């Protein structure tokens, strides 16, 4: 069923964040993990899988539960996600989710998906994100959406953001769900903790899914 839309007091307010916004920004800058048709080479814990991926070396993917790890352990997959280094351990980069079966999931062409951006309840702009996957992780679409908005609207800057609140909403026929784009209030922001929201490996159909971004200004 459908996640209820955020009421205003359920949203993180950037003015309550006194840490370094750069630590959010870098997650949605150019660099990200992207591998095509790879299979896990190892596993550290029961809820992770380890891949050998080229940087241009090893990527630990963490999942929410054992069933996700077991499902993909011996499958050829595509990997797409925002990764981190700080507090990345296994006995070098880490990410959450972002895994899809390769076989039978490829489109012929890249497919454009509208992103509708609202600012203070007003229709601000639209743009496209693209994928060549039938089933794509919400993580992939979220990264692409924010990457565009970082480049073109300075969604995140070094110190802070021009926006007080921001959430991305995914709509799939009847059902919708959303992610808070701002850091939790306080001085601390942990990349590993933030990115863990993607660890459910949530997927959507690129044919049908709609993307909306709601921003408010200060």
């Amino acid at each position, epitope marked *: 069923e459908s996640q209820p839309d955020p009421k205003p007091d359920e949203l993180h307010k950037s003015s309550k964040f006194t840490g370094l916004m750069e630590n959010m920004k870098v997650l949605y800058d150019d660099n990200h993990v992207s591998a095509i048709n790879v299979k896990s080479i190892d596993q550290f814990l029961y809820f992770d899988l380890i891949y050998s991926i080229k940087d241009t070396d090893n990527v630990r993917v963490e999942f929410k539960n054992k069933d996700l790890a077991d499902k993909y352990k011996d499958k050829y997959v595509d990997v797409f996600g925002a990764n981190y280094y700080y507090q990345c351990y296994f006995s070098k980069t880490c990410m959450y989710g972002g895994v899809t079966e390769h076989n039978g999931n490829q489109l012929d062409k890249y497919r454009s998906i509208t992103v509708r951006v609202f600012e203070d309840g007003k*229709n*601000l*702009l*639209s743009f496209d994100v693209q994928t060549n996957k039938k089933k794509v992780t919400a993580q992939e679409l979220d990264y692409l959406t924010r990457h565009y908005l970082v480049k073109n609207k300075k969604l995140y800057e070094f110190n802070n953001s021009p926006y007080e609140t921001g959430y991305i909403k995914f709509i799939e026929n009847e059902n919708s769900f959303w992610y808070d784009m701002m850091p939790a209030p306080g001085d601390k922001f942990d990349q590993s903790k933030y990115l863990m929201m993607y660890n459910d490996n949530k997927m959507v159909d690129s044919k049908d899914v*709609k993307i909306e971004v709601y921003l408010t200004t200060k």
Partner: nanobody
Framework: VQLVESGGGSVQAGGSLRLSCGPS?????????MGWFRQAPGKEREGVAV???????AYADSVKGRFTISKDNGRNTLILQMNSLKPEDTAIYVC??????????????????????WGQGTQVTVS
């Protein structure tokens, strides 16, 4: 917003038709995207050609180099110029448009779900 198509019809293979749509309900400086979709007899609706608010376009592979979408600002018309028509192009063609944005409507989506307004459709037959 209303979308009223004209210029449908029938031609021999190799022929030409020019579809036209005059959108009502927008402001003079509304920034929105517009497209042409078609639905063949027992198939899903498919995006044919789209133009965003600053005039960039995208096309389905099957019509590239044959069909041209354009927007006449002074006449307030969306045009689909259809050349080198094939039997496979037979379908009900329908105009679609989006809500308006302050800054720009950059999207060039060919997915039906991404449009907010739809015309009534006009028959094109090639045979």
């Amino acid at each position: 917003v209303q979308l009223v198509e004209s210029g449908g019809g029938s031609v021999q293979a190799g022929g030409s038709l020019r579809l036209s749509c005059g959108p009502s309900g927008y402001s003079d400086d509304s920034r929105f995207s517009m497209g042409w979709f078609r639905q063949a007899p027992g198939k899903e609706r498919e995006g044919v050609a789209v133009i965003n608010s600053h005039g960039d376009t995208a096309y389905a592979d099957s019509v590239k180099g044959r069909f041209t979408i354009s927007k006449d600002n002074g006449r307030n018309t969306l045009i689909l110029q259809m050349n080198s028509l094939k039997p496979e192009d037979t379908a009900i063609y329908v105009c679609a448009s989006t809500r308006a944005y302050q800054l720009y409507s950059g999207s060039r989506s060919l997915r039906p779900v991404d449009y907010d307004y739809w015309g009534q459709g006009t028959q094109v037959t090639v045979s």
